[PDB]
Design a protein around this ligand. Structure first.
Ligand SMILES: [Ca+2]
Ligand SMILES: [Ca+2]
Ligand SMILES: [Ca+2]
Ligand SMILES: [Ca+2]
Ligand SMILES: [Zn+2]
Ligand SMILES: [Zn+2]
Ligand SMILES: [Zn+2]
Ligand SMILES: [Zn+2]
Lengths: 381, 381, 382, 382
């Protein structure tokens, strides 16, 4: 295989991949424009798409990503499970790299919230989880190696595509509101029913109907779950406060190579506010206007759901702007790629089937550019 | 594992299993009543559910079943592909038993048309395919080992559940009619579209839209396929003539153990005709009446879609009736188990969620009885 | 010229959608495919109609709407009611089937399920008015709907209820009226108020209509302030024991009206004395049937799927007399309780259960022929 | 009292569903959410209506239905037509918006897409009758619908077409009228004739209504014998060049009627001289637009998504005069061709394209205000 470290692509919020997608549904990594996993494999590259929770928190998604790669049964931590009120153990993953350990590395590419998930999992690998450490010391038992800390030389690169490193007003003012969270969780409850084949990612909260449980008792049982009031969900983590908590508990690993990509899809109106361009995917037309009418000017330019000031880099970690041809092989610092003009949040993954300005060849070059950069990380070591 | 030979369960017509089922859809092997693959594994048994074409012919399904077990890329045969006008190569399967060969055996359990599929594939293993042999002699190239013949000691048992060994009038008078076949194929065309994640089993006929092909050209392209007029489809094979072709080209293997199971779900009206019982799954209410009003009396009693005279055994192969406690360890002869009164065609697989007379415990005992019989085949050898 | 002197008005229950207001594929409420009540009764020479009123609203809101369905005009829920519960005073405009409806021109009212209660409340309005609206008009002026004035009699010739939860149902107390289930119902109503929706689930007076230029984000935010989420002014509450008893405690017998109830039983005594649903109970009531059948009071267990037998026979302490199915049911001022129908569940009364082939259409046709023959005998004996 | 002396009747095109006959979630045909034509024009004081006619039927079947939508009564397709094409003679009964419609009481007719052709054919019926029905009645007797007699004038004041394929469209010849696509349309019609369906796709005169007691198996078998599967008496054929030309060759100019066309262009000249769809063309016409734009004759390539420009301007060899958008359009007996609207695709005329935020509602409101102002000027100048 042409890349020496496996590339793992990490979908964001709402993402469903592989056989976990519904019967008719767009293919997350590339749409019908560039089938990323398919084609990059055809070109001789070793690539994989992680399947992690679509509605869960960054913490819960970061744990699940680790088991997708390593294999095993998900262990969210005994302290975490106790503090937020959900199950400790989850799905079991075969694992794309059973012998993943210090020495065998991966490249991590994340779109949207996948970027935040990749950061939080590397943090656990490097610095551990101090609550699970204090718990395992005080009550014995077993601790997942994800929370032990001390592990290095396992992640070669972290690359983010339209990742809300600083959150988004579309979460604060819409997605994290009571009424909207109730809609998301009602969808999860329904997709937990005993006929359902797709996992929306919150079954650790109880959203799995048992085969001889009536829906009436299912409603009654899960209405007592702590999810309805919890911050351990994706909608909270995507808020400005939610993302600042993650910025404040993560740090730069001097050995990893960091890159961000950002799209802008708005245009300035005669008053200074930003409105979605035409061809901004129609489902983000309203969130784009919420972001674009912020009271702070520097928070207005956006890709539909992420303001540009959020996508460029975390606001408390160091960064350096980079041109499109400048080798992005620096380690320990966020290299901020030039904002791609005209790309909305989902043009990065090709699922905007209504935008005939964004064609396949363009997306193939973009993903070939990312792979090329990663291959240069491998050679400069 | 408690069974020395793997058990492979083979769904019938319309069946979708595993991650090939739509988002909300009943689980084929057991419904919500007894999760066959799940539970039998829990009990220490090695079991698998084959995923073969849901609308394809017995020939096409038999080829695909062989590759599901052995692994590899489906090869329908160069003569067959040329004669019926569809692709020669199909899906690639990982394979549950890569080293399957004379010496390592499987048990085969088939529901409905899966029974006919299991018979046709064993026939190929034992006696080959004379057309593919004559073709490979005349044009060289490669022949699949499925069509070579001479292979024995690879199938320990063949068990059928409500299998239409002699066809069904529900195919002759409804499912194989022009108008109905056009509906089935239109569904396959639509499920071939570029957003679709589920394989209905006729893509070798061209029913896969290419990613940059408009639906308008897709319609135009596949309207030229030979499927619309072909007999190489499931609806033809389930007809009385269709099944008699299969009976006339299969034979008993003296070393395999053969068993049939049959349900009756009709009751006799005051004129001699048969009407569906209440609790006969409502989607077979009309087909049940078509079968039950046949002009021949012995063709009327039925399970909803298969007449009892069809399910008991092929009409030209030898048989012996057997009690429910009689050891069914005889080889080379169809052992006809006692007709289960009150079971319709889908009570055998537990998906009749509207029949509260058919409970889980009853289905668990049935599948435990089949496994027990198979374990006795293993020990008497 | 119609064979019945007074029009028969059939009034659907909770969740019922009729006529053009039903989804593109959806069963036909009055008769399913088994006996098309309106179609077939019209073919026989009878003047019959299908009222269309709120599927999820309170008995009060439904009773007002039923009056305007018959009379015609813009729905007026009352200024006092609207201010008390926090919804709009005016609703839809109806064409009206009897624009001339007035003392002397009567109707026969036939209600299924909640329809039975709605029909009772509308007659209370005609005879006695609504005390709170009368007092509001006396203190503030303005216009008062004549529905709320009282004194309007000889407008209803009969009231016939089929499987009506006169005394409530535990299926509402223990499930339908729970917090989680009211949220689901109200979410469904929010969604079918969206700007592309053609069907009216009956709660738009609470704000559940999305404006043409309003985003769904802003719609969600506007209606989340509606008092419907915490209000008792809805069907789920009125179907509880307390809700139905409040109606029982504010209605009275009209001595000129012919009252008749029909009741089904679809359960059987299990081993301990509890009731479980029969084979063939429509499967959507399998769990509600068990909830009712396992009540702690034994007299409350026998049921039709969703309505206990003791609730359908008659309002708790209103006068009643048990009748045989064949004797004349022309007594006035008293609930004539027809014998309990064995094997009929709650929806066997309206034929929509297409899965149950045991209940054929001829039998449902005889059942409606019986009601019309009874109604024709009310007319002949006044 | 209405500001327009003659009612305006808007007539939808192919596939159009209006009012209560549309699915539970489905865009509103006349104006989308951008400008609710009927609602807003009524609010302004204008008497306007939304005709409801067959979505998939021929121009002939639609023109008959339009007449009964206006006049009232049971649709009579004609004994001769019914015997020739093999469908039923009688269809639905309409309430009628102008039961009094008769020489002296006029209407303004405004058609979008196929609606433009339907409106033309109905006026031919009123003025000249239908020769084949007249001859059938002379030879066999019986009753002949007055729609088919001829001699009924001064009933139509104006005919206005918006994006009407007067001369056909290659989108029908090369796609919509193909064997495979007609089968899909007819299958959709079979299915929405099923016994649970509430929406009428316009082909039930061909047998596509499942009886209440008939199994779907038997329904499929009965309607598979219908002549609709091989008939030309349907919209798909009438929208081809030959189909539209047959209508052109059997219509004539009425000297008292005011004729007006509007046309959109949504394509741009590609590198070779072919036309490709603009960014913002409604995506369902992306492929049809390219089919039209790559025609071998250059004058046939410019298009709005589904109708070529040369087809919308006016019927091929019927008299026409090009007008500016501001001059009085009160000439009678001649197609007044309004200037081609740049950037408007086929559905921008009716506002249903919710994805295209560039075409806002104020602009669509001005467009309908222009039509009504033109219609009011027809009335003032007679
Ligand atoms: Ca875009
Ligand atoms: Ca059954
Ligand atoms: Ca029933
Ligand atoms: Ca447009
Ligand atoms: Zn968690
Ligand atoms: Zn084949
Ligand atoms: Zn109210
Ligand atoms: Zn016709």
């Amino acid at each position: 295989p042409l890349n020496k470290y496996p590339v793992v692509f990490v979908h964001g919020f709402l993402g469903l991949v592989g056989d976990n997608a519904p019967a008719l549904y767009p293919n997350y990594w590339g749409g019908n424009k560039f089938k990323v996993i398919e084609e990059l494999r055809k070109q001789g590259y070793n690539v994989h798409q992680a399947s992690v929770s679509a509605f869960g928190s960054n913490y819960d998604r970061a744990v699940e990503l680790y088991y997708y790669i390593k294999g095993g049964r998900v262990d969210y931590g005994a302290a975490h499970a106790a503090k937020y009120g959900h199950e400790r153990y989850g799905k079991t993953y075969k694992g794309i790299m059973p012998n993943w350990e210090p020495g065998k590395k991966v490249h991590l590419v994340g779109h949207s919230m996948g970027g935040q998930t990749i950061r939080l999992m590397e943090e656990f690998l490097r610095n551990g989880n101090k609550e699970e450490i204090a718990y395992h010391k005080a009550h014995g038992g077993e601790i997942s190696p994800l929370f032990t800390g001390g592990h290095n030389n396992m992640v070669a690169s972290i690359t983010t595509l339209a990742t809300p490193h600083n959150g988004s007003q579309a979460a604060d003012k819409f997605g994290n509101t009571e009424a909207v969270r109730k809609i998301m969780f009602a969808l999860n409850r329904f997709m937990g029913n005993k006929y359902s084949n797709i996992d929306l990612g919150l079954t650790q909260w109880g959203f799995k109907q048992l085969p001889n449980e009536s829906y009436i008792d299912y409603i009654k049982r899960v209405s007592k779950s702590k999810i309805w009031t919890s911050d351990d969900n994706a909608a909270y983590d995507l808020t400005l406060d939610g993302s600042a908590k993650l910025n404040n508990m993560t740090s730069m690993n001097p050995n990893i190579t960091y890159t961000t990509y950002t799209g802008v899809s708005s245009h300035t109106g005669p008053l200074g506010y930003e409105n979605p361009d035409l061809g901004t995917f129609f489902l983000m037309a309203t969130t784009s206007r919420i972001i674009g009418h912020d009271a702070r000017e520097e928070w207005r330019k956006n890709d539909g759901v992420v303001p540009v000031i959020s996508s460029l880099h975390p606001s408390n970690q160091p960064f350096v702007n980079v041109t499109n041809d400048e080798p992005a092989t620096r380690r320990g610092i966020w290299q901020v790629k030039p904002i791609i003009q005209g790309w909305d949040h989902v043009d990065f993954i090709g699922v905007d089937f209504l935008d005939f300005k964004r064609k396949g060849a363009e997306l193939a070059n973009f993903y070939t550019g990312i792979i090329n950069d990663l291959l240069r990380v491998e050679a400069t070591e």
